[PDB]
Amino acid sequence: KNIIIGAMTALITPFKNGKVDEQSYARLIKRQIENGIDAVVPVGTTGESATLTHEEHRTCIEIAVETCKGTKVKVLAGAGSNATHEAVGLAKFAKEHGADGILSVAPYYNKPTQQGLYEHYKAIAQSVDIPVLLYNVPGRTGCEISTDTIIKLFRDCENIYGVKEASGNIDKCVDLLAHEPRMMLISGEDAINYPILSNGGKGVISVTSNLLPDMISALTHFALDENYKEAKKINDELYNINKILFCESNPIPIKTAMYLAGLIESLEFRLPLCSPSKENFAKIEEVMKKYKIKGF
Amino acid sequence: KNIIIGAMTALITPFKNGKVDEQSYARLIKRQIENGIDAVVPVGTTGESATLTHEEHRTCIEIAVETCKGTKVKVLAGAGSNATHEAVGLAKFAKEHGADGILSVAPYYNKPTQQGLYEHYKAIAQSVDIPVLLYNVPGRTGCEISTDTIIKLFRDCENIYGVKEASGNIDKCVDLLAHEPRMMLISGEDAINYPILSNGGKGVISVTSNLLPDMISALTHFALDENYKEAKKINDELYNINKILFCESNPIPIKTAMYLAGLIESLEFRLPLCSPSKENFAKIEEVMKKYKIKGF
Amino acid sequence: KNIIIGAMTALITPFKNGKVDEQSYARLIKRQIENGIDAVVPVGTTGESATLTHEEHRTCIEIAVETCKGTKVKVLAGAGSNATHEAVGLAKFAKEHGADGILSVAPYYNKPTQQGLYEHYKAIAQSVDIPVLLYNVPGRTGCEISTDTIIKLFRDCENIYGVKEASGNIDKCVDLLAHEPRMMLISGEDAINYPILSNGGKGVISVTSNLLPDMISALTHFALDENYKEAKKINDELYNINKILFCESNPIPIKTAMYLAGLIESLEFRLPLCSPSKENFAKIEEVMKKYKIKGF
Amino acid sequence: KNIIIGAMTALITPFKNGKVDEQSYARLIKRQIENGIDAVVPVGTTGESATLTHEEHRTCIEIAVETCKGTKVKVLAGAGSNATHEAVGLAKFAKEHGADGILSVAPYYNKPTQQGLYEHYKAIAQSVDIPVLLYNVPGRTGCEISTDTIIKLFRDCENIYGVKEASGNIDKCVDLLAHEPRMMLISGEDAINYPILSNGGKGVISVTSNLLPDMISALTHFALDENYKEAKKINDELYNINKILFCESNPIPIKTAMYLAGLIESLEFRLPLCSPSKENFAKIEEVMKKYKIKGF
Ligand SMILES: NCCCC[C@@](N)(CC[C@](N)(CCCCN)C(=O)O)C(=O)O
Ligand SMILES: NCCCC[C@@](N)(CC[C@](N)(CCCCN)C(=O)O)C(=O)O
Ligand SMILES: [Mg+2]
Ligand SMILES: [Mg+2]
């Protein structure tokens, strides 16, 4: 299978006067490229996919594709939806506009059965010829892609090559790779990046890397080179920021941190997201003081 | 406050050849009207809101409004979204096209904070002048509207008049009505309709009533009249069907039951929803046997 | 079946200088009798059954039996254990020493299967000829007595007559009484006393009644007479204290309130239970001012 | 600090005609010694601590001590209780009778606060001068020893040297060793032995090692020697058996396997534990056949 692995960033989507700040977006992506990242994920959960229109979503995929040209950095385009016809449309767009693969979140809110998830992802995978990474985040979607369903999809569809796990369930990560060791398990939970990598995970799709791209890429690359001692070191050092970036619902803290670091111009969300409490603002600012944040 | 209460049905959306079966939809609504239902909810969770387009969602709201004209039956239009700008667009549409009020589910997938939920619903309520019923279903959305948040919205926004609770949490139902007894608490969970009504709930938004409208309406009207012995007897009789209708994710069982009863022509969903297992199909058919199903 | 129902109190066990304060225990029981309580439960969870020796447990049952003689008040003796041979010993002691029935908590820590729970309670029920009330509290025991197992035990063992439920699950309470309406469902969760009683539950085993026995007794008897307006009003009034009495693990808050009320001499627990935090101490003190607390 | 780490076994307790089969108990330990195990845990959860009397509990500690005498293998005696005065008595007994250290499970059923857990373990640690390993298993006890509480106890009581974690929470394992890398984190959950060890955990207290001591000891020793490749390979091979040994509550499956393998003479439990279902019996037998089970 064609794969997209290594250190990856779930890019925040900056807003200015309620519109996507397209120049800021390209600048943030170039900062990722210059700090050792292997791929970027436009419009994942961290990019506020829910509140972008289908047009803004497509614009952000294009900006990512254009910005990574002339580099090794791949674009793993966010293309999931809880409606299969929407997810297929996003997948075809990503392929036709030069994305290297797609991320595809489990349908949220309508809770498909395992049979429905299989049919959902088969339809998506049959619509394009580029790699497809599943994405399990049950605390947000209300559903779980079972290990058996992930393995069946991996074996039955040529371009489905792995899963981003954001489930806080290392037992499930053992289950996945013990029964199907050819799949690419990708960490979607920064605090446990190293444990997932040490069990044979092959990359991360990170929130923290928005702020600290050099640290996440170093951790991932150490782990892939089997220097687990140094990968663990960075994972342990990052624990405090990894946790504080979820003191409120992601991406509220990471955008707060990017704004405090001077990396975006305004602390702007689209409703229903909004600024953190005054207390959590101060907590984020305090934890940032322990880390060295790269500029542009 | 202006209110919409009593026995209400979360309408299924019949599909045929992949499109909304508009005639069948109108006929199903007339069957509800003729069996004592007080309001209908087009395009809630049970109506597959996630997989309809915005144009089909609007078409179904229009069909409900047109079908209920000249009757006592109200239209409480499904209008929620996880993007506040989409939820405002749906609310304004419902108002402008003659809905009696709106239902508005808590944002799914993006997990807003309590402050964000407040701003989300404040924006929706300020955009129209018709009643707004909040809708809490944390197992599907990944977030919970707290009792404090519900009460503040009820007190701060003129048109927000209560909440549909689908959280299996009778403690919260006590919390709500003990601290704010003027709100309209509505059961969103058929198996516990009677406990919610007996604590001062004023209506239900039912899945089971799709199949058994006369029984749910009777349960509710007995309960509102304080004939608790008779309301409890029906709630107890309905327990088996109320639960089997969730053997797989709603609306897969209720549509399966409607098809088995001959009330819709095709057992069609939109992916990622799909037919139940062969085992659950048989369980649904077996439980239906002990209930008397009204035809057209 | 012989039954023990109505308003019942899970008695605290007062300590002084590390020993059971026997005189105080009898005094507290007399106060319960004089305030309309129908039964007292010595050495349940609220009575710190875990940290009493087998001898003290037996002393406390004996004091309760002595104190209720010549009154209408029954003794439903705490007799549970996670070891069946221990639970049978307590059951036989309770019978031989004149208890009217026994409460028997689901085995904690060792998590028996449903078959194991069935055989456990069958062994207990076969060992005595007095009423046995099962007791389900999964948040504390780590196991659940399923509705099917409760009903099988009720139907198969002639002295098992119902269940004390402390599970926050009104759906299960409907399930229980819809399939086996002859059993006595007893509320083990003060905040939802009224919803359980209004669904056909027949009593409460209360924590709050230690402090406010007259109010819990009135609620229960109103509800048993289907005077639901008055029963719900008291349940609503009691909600704030019912919840604050679990700001820390029961019985830490209720013992704190009894001490603040001047009903016991010293705020004494047996480790690992201990005095509450300073804030929760003040929180308990503040909610108490809203209620009228009977003296001796 | 003095420590007890490496590959350890939570010994089953065989029964014969309802009594501890002491001669089989010693033989099982000797088989563990012969297969590379570093320490044995008499009368933990897997040893049915709940249903042994205090005297049987003590007898099993004595057998372990005597059996391991003159060998390199240590005895980490189960000494926990939900009553602090009982846990202190067991701790002192183990010290006085030659145990190398004690395991002490968090109090079950009575749900102490974090302050209570601290005082509980401080009382135990101060009663002896041998190493004390905390033991967190919230699914069984109903309480959690927080990371902050574990770390304070480790830093404040010289003999407290680590924690056996059975919580399915690799994030917490990162939290623990990132903030206190000096403690000995011990896996109490066989399926995730390797991820816990790969993050710096220093041993396992295993259920599976009862049946396959050579495989669990090898897994642990590869990981301690930083051969993560081979430690993960064994962890992956063992996943199927590691999970099936919990198809019913531990130790119901492990005793069933020990009996099927001819290693214990009778499949006897003490109520409320009992034989597994016929189906689960069959599943266990089927999974065991894929592994090489050492004899005596
Ligand atoms: N990524 C850009 C599109 C975002 C659209 C949407 N807000 C809503 C998606 C939808 N399937 C739309 C249904 C509209 C008719 N009710 C949903 O809300 O479920 C989401 O997926 O979160
Ligand atoms: N109610 C008075 C007796 C209380 C005894 C005990 N503390 C411990 C019960 C026990 N079965 C004792 C096991 C002793 C041998 N390890 C347990 O701890 O599980 C409890 O049940 O909570
Ligand atoms: Mg640009
Ligand atoms: Mg996606």
Ligand SMILES: [Mg+2]
């Ligand atoms: Mg009437």
Ligand SMILES: [Mg+2]
């Ligand atoms: Mg004791």
Ligand SMILES: [Mg+2]
């Ligand atoms: Mg009367």
Ligand SMILES: [Mg+2]
């Ligand atoms: Mg030997």
Ligand SMILES: [Mg+2]
């Ligand atoms: Mg122990």
Ligand SMILES: [Mg+2]
């Ligand atoms: Mg265990």
